[PDB]
């Protein structure tokens, strides 16, 4: 009757492991969290130079990115705790094979069920955080679209904004000395001969270039936020399936007798299945700050 018991336990461990791996090898990897962290820290740059409307957008975008990041870490710390429970519990599971008996088999059953049970609990808590993270990415992406529209309007050659900058640069250059340099918006530095229009219509292309690069930046962020959103959505969807499968597996395990006459292969296969999740959990915790 062993091979059914073996099936159940292997499936239990591998299923739990696969859910953990949706964080460990998917979420932690395919979303550029680090890039987002750098971006958040930079977004206040040049805040006073944006139009009133653009400024509000950029600000709101920053907050929403901070929230998305905060929520992914909230998810991470919940799953971390499960990982820590799983790694110690599965090591005990492995050791209980030593000088096996019916008591130890019963102990193994309690251990597996706890790992599954704690898993369902923690992963479900984590889902709520992932959903919020998702909704903040989504709201951010919408605002990034509005911002792109706002900037096209602002940076348009015939706009009040753009003209207000062209003449500011001109005034400073006429009030300055020849063969100097003039500072513009968003960091721009220009040579006196470009600004004063010694060669007419050659200052504007410099301003256009700067403003376009600002817009290109927000477009790159938009593309990256949109992709992050699909990826987080795909993971949390897949997690809903896996959480439910863990639930069915827990119920089956509860009605499963662990004490049987396992052959050598079966023992090895069971130990290996447990070891693999232990490794996954250790790699996860180490990435998220677990110190030796």
From Swiss-Prot:
Annotated signal peptide: none
Subunit structure: Monomer and oligomer. In periplasm, it is present as a monomer, while in outer membrane vesicles, it oligomerizes to form a pore structure that is active. The pore is formed by a dodecamer.
Protein's name in the database: Hemolysin E, chromosomal
Annotated function: Toxin, which has some hemolytic activity towards mammalian cells. Acts by forming a pore-like structure upon contact with mammalian cells.
Family: Belongs to the hemolysin E family.
GO biological process: hemolysis in another organism
Mutation effect (residue 93 to H): Strongly reduces cytotoxic activity
Molecular function terms from GO: identical protein binding; toxin activity
Gene that encodes the chain: hlyE
Induction and repression of expression: During anaerobic growth. Weakly or not expressed in most strains. It is activated by SlyA, while it is silenced by H-NS. Its expression is also regulated by CRP and FNR.
InterPro entries, per the entry: Hemolysin_E
Primary residence: secreted
Cysteine pairs bridged by disulfides in the record: 83-281
Transmembrane segments annotated in the record for this chain: 179-199
């Amino acid at each position: 009757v062993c091979d059914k018991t073996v099936e159940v336990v292997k499936n239990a461990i591998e299923t739990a492991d696969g859910a953990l791996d949706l964080y460990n090898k998917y979420l932690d990897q395919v979303i550029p969290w680090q890039t987002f962290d750098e971006t958040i820290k930079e977004l206040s740059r040049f805040k006073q130079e944006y139009s009133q409307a653009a400024s509000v957008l950029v600000g709101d975008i920053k907050t929403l990115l901070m929230d998305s990041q905060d929520k992914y870490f909230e998810a991470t710390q919940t799953v971390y705790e499960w990982a820590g429970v799983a790694t110690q519990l599965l090591a005990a599971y492995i050791l209980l094979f030593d000088e096996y008996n019916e008591k130890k088999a019963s102990a193994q059953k309690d251990i597996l069920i706890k790992v599954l049970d704690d898993g369902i609990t923690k992963l479900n808590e984590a889902q709520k955080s992932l959903l919020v993270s998702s909704q903040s990415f989504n709201n951010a992406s919408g605002k990034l679209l509005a911002l792109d529209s706002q900037l096209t309007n602002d940076f348009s050659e015939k706009s009040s904004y753009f003209q207000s900058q062209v003449d500011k640069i001109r005034k400073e250059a006429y009030a300055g000395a020849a063969a100097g340099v003039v500072a513009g918006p968003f960091g721009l530095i220009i040579s006196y001969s470009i600004a004063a229009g010694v060669v007419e219509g050659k200052l504007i292309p410099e301003l256009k270039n700067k403003l376009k690069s600002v817009q290109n930046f927000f477009t790159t962020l938009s593309n990256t936020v949109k992709q992050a959103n699909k990826d987080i959505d795909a993971a949390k969807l897949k997690l809903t399936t896996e959480i439910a499968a863990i639930g069915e597996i827990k119920t089956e395990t509860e009605t499963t007798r662990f004490y049987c006459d396992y052959d050598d292969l079966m023992l090895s296969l069971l130990k290996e299945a447990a070891k693999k999740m232990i490794n996954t959990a250790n790699e996860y915790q180490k990435r998220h700050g677990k110190k030796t």
